[PDB]
User: Fold this.
Amino acid sequence: NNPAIKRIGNHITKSPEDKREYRGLELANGIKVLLISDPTTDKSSAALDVHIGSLSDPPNIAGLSHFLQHMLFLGTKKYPKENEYSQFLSEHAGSSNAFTSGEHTNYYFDVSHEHLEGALDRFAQFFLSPLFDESAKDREVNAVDSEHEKNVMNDAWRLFQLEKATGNPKHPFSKFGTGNKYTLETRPNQEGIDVRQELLKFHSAYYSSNLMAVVVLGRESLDDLTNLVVKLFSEVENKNVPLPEFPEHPFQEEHLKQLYKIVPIKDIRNLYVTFPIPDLQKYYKSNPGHYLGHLIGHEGPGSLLSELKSKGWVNTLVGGQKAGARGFMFFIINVDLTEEGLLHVEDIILHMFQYIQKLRAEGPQEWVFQELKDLNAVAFRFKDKERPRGYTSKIAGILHYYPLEEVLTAEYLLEEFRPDLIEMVLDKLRPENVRVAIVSKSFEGKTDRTEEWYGTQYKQEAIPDAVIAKWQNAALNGKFKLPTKNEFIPTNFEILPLEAAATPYPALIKDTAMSKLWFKQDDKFFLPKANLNFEFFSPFAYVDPLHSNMAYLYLELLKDSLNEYAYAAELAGLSYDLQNTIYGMYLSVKGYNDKQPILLKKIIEKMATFEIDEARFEIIKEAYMRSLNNFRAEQPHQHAMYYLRLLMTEVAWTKDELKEALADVTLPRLKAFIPQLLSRLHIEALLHGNITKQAALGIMQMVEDTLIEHAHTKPLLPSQLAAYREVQLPDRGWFVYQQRNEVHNNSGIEIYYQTDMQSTSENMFLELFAQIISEPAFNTLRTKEQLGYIVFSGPRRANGIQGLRFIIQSEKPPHYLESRVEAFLITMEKSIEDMTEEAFQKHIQALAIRRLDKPKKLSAESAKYWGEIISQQYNFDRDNTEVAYLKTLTKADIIKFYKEMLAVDAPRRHKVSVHVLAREMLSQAPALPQPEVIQNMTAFKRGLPLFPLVKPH
Amino acid sequence: NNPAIKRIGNHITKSPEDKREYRGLELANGIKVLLISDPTTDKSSAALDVHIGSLSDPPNIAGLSHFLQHMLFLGTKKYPKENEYSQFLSEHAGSSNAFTSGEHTNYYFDVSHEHLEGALDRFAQFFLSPLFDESAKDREVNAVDSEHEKNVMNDAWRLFQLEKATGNPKHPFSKFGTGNKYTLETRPNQEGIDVRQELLKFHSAYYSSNLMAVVVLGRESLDDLTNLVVKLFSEVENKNVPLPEFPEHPFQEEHLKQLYKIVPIKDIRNLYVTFPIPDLQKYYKSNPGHYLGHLIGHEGPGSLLSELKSKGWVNTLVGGQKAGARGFMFFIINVDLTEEGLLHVEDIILHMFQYIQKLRAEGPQEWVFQELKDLNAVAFRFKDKERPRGYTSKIAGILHYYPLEEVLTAEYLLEEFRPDLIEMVLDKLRPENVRVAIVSKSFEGKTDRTEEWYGTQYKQEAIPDAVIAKWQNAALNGKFKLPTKNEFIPTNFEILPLEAAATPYPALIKDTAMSKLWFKQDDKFFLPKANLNFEFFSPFAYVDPLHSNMAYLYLELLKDSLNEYAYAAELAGLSYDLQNTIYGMYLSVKGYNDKQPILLKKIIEKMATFEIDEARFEIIKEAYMRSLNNFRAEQPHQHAMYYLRLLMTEVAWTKDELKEALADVTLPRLKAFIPQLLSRLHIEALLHGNITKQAALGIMQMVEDTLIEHAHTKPLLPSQLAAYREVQLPDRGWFVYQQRNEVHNNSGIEIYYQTDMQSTSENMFLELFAQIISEPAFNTLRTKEQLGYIVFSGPRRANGIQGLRFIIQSEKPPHYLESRVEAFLITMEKSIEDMTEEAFQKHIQALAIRRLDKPKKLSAESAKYWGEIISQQYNFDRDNTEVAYLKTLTKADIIKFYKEMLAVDAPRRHKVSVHVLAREMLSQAPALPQPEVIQNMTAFKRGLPLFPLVKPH
Amino acid sequence: APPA
Ligand SMILES: [Zn+2]
Ligand SMILES: [Zn+2]
Assistant:
């Protein structure tokens, strides 16, 4: 009947809790499509995933498919303006990104639901007639180069490429996927390559309809979405391109039984054990690799990790299957190493093989399979509603792997018990097939090879035949046992009726010396889950660096101690987060409500009766010292943000101060600290989800009673509930703080234009200005001027105060970056003067949509309320109130705000800049004043006033 | 704060390139105001637009609002002297006019910038206390009558009123807006109506401050302009008049599906298709009517026009939205018709409905809307600076439709794509809603109706149901496609730095046998535009009537051939003019410099390689024959001017000579002609704008190289570069040539008092005398004596010679008109003798200001230079030199000049009069000699000497 | 052309 549609799928299986409607189809040209109708959505979304990626780059142009991914955003025949796409999205509350992996290039956006067709039309042209403009190409190659640079000193990226470089060099797996200025411009120029032509040729050859999948989500009916996708995508040409396949494993015989010794950037110690395996993707209905990963990676009693930790050799372990490409996969067992563990790598690996042998001895267990199946079924049924942008992008990828009807369920529902496949995979996990990599600063000076793209220093050796033989002879170790039945699996999914007195926002249902309890029974999502958030206030968590260290160590030790018990709950969809803060402690328990009070009670009890194991203490102390030292290897822009935080906040201990005080933390001292920390507390909580008022009051009082019983906790005084203030900068002031990053050879800058205390009017002046300049800042400072890959602008909010911030990471010196940001601000003032009234209203509407966008899941709603609570503003109806005010603003209002607070000659300009120098280190910019250079943070803060704190709503 | 001011407008959004300053306000009495401060302007200006016009005329006094518009100029209580306003303006380098439309009456002036307050005060009185003097009314009604007459035999006005006459007779749309002596005097007198009373009643009821908008542009600051406007306009009374609205369409069901057959005056063949549509004005942010007009009216490949032209049925097409009034509009598709097209009207209309069906099939196209939006943005940004008088008038009209802040942007910038509104309008363009009018001489003697005001002969018939049904079933025609992306859109807006060797005036930078090249780099406007002007001299363009015909036909065919390609360039702000001249060919390329070389090269290439289509040849030849014949229907004063040109120029072929020779132009002869024409040329060029000396030389070389390559062009000899002379009249001679206009029942006259060759002194004697008599001539011969609506005096310049001319069109016989002009000259002599030194110096200063008035845009400056070049006087600093000389002239000098050259008894009087009789045809005038009556123009010229040609500066 |  319809020539443009090859087939329409049968019913797309979905959760009975999922109210979105679905239709799958395949266009005549071979594009697989999922349409998603959600008449409730505030943002609509589309994604397209092409089944081609960096494994297919020309061997003489590394990075081409990734470079092409960048270039597709920079103009098409129908929409030739370089930022037409980005500008359109920004002006309609939208956003976009993309990525390139070895076999996929995935593009996605969201946008206001009223402007889906406009966004999708501009998007579709990417796949029809990109311009690959010569000038755009010359500029954007710099962004890719800066992307690569950012990764160069990153340990994870270095290991990622090292693995590729130590397999078969003839295999496409060995390719460098990012590319850089050298591979994408310098070398091609030397070799007479016309890169524009190569981009065109690659697009023409591989961007074929037959290798594409598209997903569109909007308020429109499935019929209207259908007509829309046919209309825009049926014109993509089918070149009938064979799907690339890689049946030959990158790791052949000569790449097995090998040991690599590797020097990291950070002071880290890790062991990576890898086995090549066949591609298991086609076995998704049984998932033999996940079965084995579940067991080998278990953290409960009897597990591999439990014994390795008890021996004091490792702290964490990750195990299971790892994607490769079509035709090959890996199975891994990776662990971190204590100091002793580093000396016992051969033994650690022997235990790995002993655990594997236990699996072989017991044989495949149907009951384990059944647990995994049951948990996946529950996870699928009660899955949180996803944000459209991530949902479309994800589905577009998986449409390539599953029948239309199964795309939603394929990754969840298990159907087949396959002991034959389990055995088959287990038979690959043998010493004769192993690769071993050790990462440690101890190899410094002892290496003889260098990886070309990152400079990674390493040594390769054959593993001795005697070592292999010992591993092959691994016997059963009595410490290893299969997990027992998971008692945390939930079975009560009853949704409690909405109470007569239920409220739309959290209500304060308890207000006592000890505790403040905000409660809301879920009235939106109706899944059997709840979030229980607690802030524990105590002066002794942050009184000095020593105590801040002890608060940290106490909670790390506590989590380490509960891990074995809590791991079963985590598998069963019940998790917790526990951490020290500048005001005390933060605890959040989330997931299925059924067994939640059991886990919560256990945590609080353990907190209040904690007994420290001395060996765990020393190990965790050493790891924490390294974590503090390792900050030196974070990126320049992360440094800049950190320094700004220290500068602008009333109290803040530096990493240097923490690590100095760490040597003074002894076991007796930590033992004394805990009862003192818990002796006086105030608890402010948000309990939100599938729970009644009475259950909420009972959970709160259970927590209190537990601390009272075991820690003799008494209430803090109201005056001790002190929040920290932000430093108040002087009118017309400019301060600069300058540091150097010793690891990275890029600079970082953060510029902060402090405005005033948060309030309805001040919030919306700043947010509207930020909205207006958001896309132009990126377009100007990155796309045109190419200062770096990382270019950010937006509101900065802290301690009730706010202002406008810019963050850039660049090869250029910070003083140069400063001048270009100042040039840009003048550009924006003229831009606002020149923009039409309607363009101004569009920005108001875009901000409005962004602010009113409804949470799709419980934790998103909880996060908003929690923000009101921890800031102590308690403005639960903020979005309505602030958007109402926003809509009354005029161009004149914003120009005046800029002239008063932001302009270079503004009477109330309050500017502080953090300059982070690299390791070794156009519109007209205005002349700037001489800055006051900050020499000492403490003296800086002492010599300035402190803002007031914002008053509660 | 200031009580006379209700609100002051926020920032008025303007073009980034616009240095003028703006302030909007609303006065307490409701007048909307825009103030424009331009400290560089040589003339200041004001306009006031009242939102009432002829749709509000009393049903029994057709023309009242128009008549009122005339009367406001003829005296106020403060300034009762009948011509005080006009005389003041003339004495201060100013000018004024006004117009009356259905809903607006718009009055405007300019004046020397030093005299803004004086003119503005006189102007303001129009809106406060007009005299409507009884004697002025009885005279000025004749001007309105004469204005109407002039229009009676004009096909456009006839059609304009016929449409009104064929809609609902009860709707105000049906009204006759001009009025005439019958409707404004005779009928009122017989009905006992007091017209002065009615004028006052109309002014009182409708000239209300709430329906007024005023714009004032001057050198003054915005604050001073603000005070000036408040001072002069806050006293205008607010009657709080409701704004007329016309929500019912003048075309109701009984007016649809109607066909009109109309006899024109000229031999023209046209087809007018009209659909009634809702008022689209409120949709201006999306402008769906402009979107549909852009497509339906498109002239590029795939268009409706292209196929109609290929079928050989039409040559030109206009399509799109047409204004009605508040509440109603129209959508039109109008074409001319070939002889075959006249026989195929039903088919042409079918094709119109097929193209519309194609638009419906494809649905609205966002990329089209975006391209329009972006081109509009570019146009707005780089908009030429406007002349004050037109700018104030235009802005005063639009202040009624847009908020103060949006008045500059409102008619350029498009904002939102509204596909729903496009579909709504497209849904109106259906056969059941159509009106069809065919204009053709073939209906002579076949009509049965007469329109009352013009006498238009026509017939009306219902369109048969069978015909409507066939149009309703219009299907897709493979010939029609949407436009392709416009590839002429400019992208390079770089303004090149002014060169070290840049000159203030054009410099001669190439001077060879083949080409003379004048060049100037713009040093005033700094917009990314240029003007490229070329004169190609060849003796074969005008050697005889046949060659003149061939030169015309060649260029018409060339333009016709290039039209599809050049239309896109047009839309993208890049245009060209190409025409045959008496000396060869003229080519001008104007607009954005970016892609100019590409269009220019295409034109020259096409010129030199031109291949004629025989069918286009015959069609264009037939149109040209009618065009020559149709001159018989031009106005008597246009005839007079034409005959004087023929009489006074050495060589000039008449329309009769041209058409006699036209039958003889055959395709083979035209083909032979072109290479002959191009074989030898001299090219004189002016390249002025955003271009460097080097690019200028490169452009010229490309032009030369292209003709040399394809046409084998070689240079002319210098002796061949002849220019034509003016006939030298004998001292004391008076010649009269008499002809009759066979169409109009008015006479026309031109009287020419030849003085002498142009020179600094002779030029300024003549221009100062003209300045002095200018306003008095109009006041005397029109306002007092009411000889006609058209009364003009001023310098005549031709072929290096000059003199004083008068042109009048009148119901009176030309011999009467002669005596009245002669009577006026004597009055002026006495007036000049009596005038004070003060008055005399005012006239010198007024002329000075007019001559030194600075060009506001590139093309105004180019035109000045171009005048110096084609006249071969090359006096680029003329204005400064001639004004310096002007300032030394005395009253006695002027009197002597008059006595020697112009007076009736002048020794060197040289008079030639052209008398054009109508179809059916107080101060003391002096006795006149008997004229020599010219019987034959050739004989006349043979019997007189010819002047020399002026020498180059 | 469009009218306009
Ligand atoms: Zn990238
Ligand atoms: Zn008039």
Q: What stands out?
A: Residues B 66, 70, 144, 147 surround zinc ion (ligand 2) (CB under 6 Å).
